[model samples]
Target: GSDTTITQNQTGYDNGYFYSFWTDAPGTVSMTLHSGGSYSTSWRNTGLFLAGKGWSTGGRRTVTYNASFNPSGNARLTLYGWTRNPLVSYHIVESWGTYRPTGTYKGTVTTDGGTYDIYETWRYNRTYQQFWSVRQQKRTSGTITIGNHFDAWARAGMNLGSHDYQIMATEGYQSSGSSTVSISEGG
Candidate 1:
C-alpha cells in the first residue's frame, strides 16, 4: 500500500491511517508513515497524526503498533482516542503529555508496568479525560488493549469516552528532527 506523505504543510494517508502534518521550521518537514511499515518524520512545531476510526468501544480488544524515533527537540508520541458526540466531545489519553488537565486530578492508573496520572477537564468544544502516563517510563512498543483501562476508569466512577476513534500521534511542540513510526496493522 502507498504511504501517507507530509511535507512542509500537507496531509495524507498510508495503509489505513490518516495523517495531518504542518510546521514553521526553516527546512522541510516530511514523513512517510504507513500501516505495517516504517513511519518517519522531520518537523519543527507540527502535529504528526496516525489514526484509525469507527472501531468498537470498551470491549475486549487489543490494539498494537511499533515505533521508534530520534527527536532533536521536544516531542511526544501520544496514544489517544476520541468518542463520538453531537455538539460536544470526549477524549481518552493512554500516554503522557505536557498538556495537564485543569479539571480535577482523578488518581493514578498502573497498566503494563506504567503509572499514569488521571485527570478530567472540560473545554469549549468538548470535555477531555486523560491518563497522563509517566514519561520515559512507559511502553511505546508492542500490543496494547483499552478495555482494561476503560474498566479501571469506570470502577473509579469516571468515563473517558466512547471508543469511536483511536489516534497514535506525535505532537512536535517547538520540536524538530526525524523519526519513524511503524504501525503493525493490516489495511
Candidate 2:
C-alpha cells in the first residue's frame, strides 16, 4: 500500500534480499538502500554474512529483488561496503536501475589481495512506454584468493546499516552509474 521497508526476515537467500557483502575479519560493511522494497540474506542475528573463512575471514554476499516487492511503481537502489578490524577496505559498490535494461554503465575494480565477479539480472517492463526496465544485480561469483582480493562483502546488522542505500532516478526512468576499481592492497 505504501513505501515500506521490507525487512529481510525471510528464509534462505533469494530475490528478496536488499543488501549483500562479504569480508575477512570483524568489520562493518554498509549496503545502501536507495529505495523501499524487500531484502533477505543468510545471516540471522543482524551482522556480517561471514563467508570463505569464519568470524574474521572472507566469504560470499548477495541481495536479490522481485516484482512483488515493488509496489511503488519505481525504486532505485545502491549498495556500499565498509569494514574495520584487521584493516580498512571497500569490497564493492552496486546500483539497481528503474525497470529498463538499457543504459550506459562502465567501471574498473582492481584488487591486489582479492578477486571479484560481476553478475546482473535482465527483464522486461511493459508499464513504461519510453524505455526498457533493467534491474542491476552484481555478486562475487568468484573468490578473492589473489593477495586477498575480495569478491563480496557482508549483509546488514539489523537496521544499523539498513540506511546505507541511496536512490537515483530520473522522473520515471532508472539508470545506474558505472563502478570503477583501480587497485587495493591486503598482505
Candidate 3:
C-alpha cells in the first residue's frame, strides 16, 4: 500500500523539480513557482531572469531589464530546485539554477541560515557573450512544526537601489499551512 507521500519518502529519489527557459530578446521575465512537491508551474510566487549583455538599471537584482540578448543565440540556461529525493538521505540538501548573467546581475545571494553558497557562476561562451548564471539555494531551517506540506511562490525584478529596492530583483513566498514540503515513506 504505497501512496504518493510514501513513494516520495523512499530513499534515493530526487524530490526537487527542474525549470529551464529562454527569452526572445531581453525583457522583464516572470513565472509562477510552487514550493516543493507537485507540478504547479503556474503558482503565484514566480521568478524573473535576464540573459544579456551590459548591466541592468539596478546593481542588485538578478533580472536586469533593458539588457540585450541575441534571441536564444547562445544563452543556454538551467535552473534546479529542492526535490524530495527518496533514495539519498540529506540533512542539508543542496541544489542550484544555472544561466547566463550579464550586466549588473553579477553578485551572490545567501539565504537566512545557509552555511555554504548553493550556486556558482562561470563563463558560457568564448567571447563572454554567453555567461553562466548559477543560483545557490538550500533548506537550512527544515520544516515547521505546524505543517510540513509547505507551498510558496516567488518573483524577481530589477529596480534602482536608491529607490529603497533590494537592488537584486528577487522575491519568494511559502505555503500558509507549513513552511516546508512533506517527507514520508509509505502508509
Instruction: Superpose all Cα atoms of candidate 2 onto the true structure and report the RMSD in Å to 1 decimal.
Output: 16.9
Q: How accurate locally is residue 150 in candidate 2, as Cα lDDT from 0 to 100?
A: 32
lDDT value, candidate 2, whole model: 0.24
> 1 or 3: which has the higher lDDT?
1
Give lDDT for model 1. 0.50
**Which lDDT values do the candidates have, in the order given?**
0.50, 0.24, 0.21
Better of 2 and 3 by lDDT: 2
* Top lDDT prediction, candidate number: 1
Model 2, 167: alpha-carbon shift in Å?
14
Using TM-score as the measure, the top candidate is: 1
In order, how many clashes per candidate? 2, 42, 33
lDDT ranking of the models: 1, 2, 3
Candidates 1 and 2 compared: the better one by lDDT is 1
State the lDDT at 63 in candidate 1: 59
Q: Provide the lowest-lDDT 10-residue window in model 2.
A: 153-162
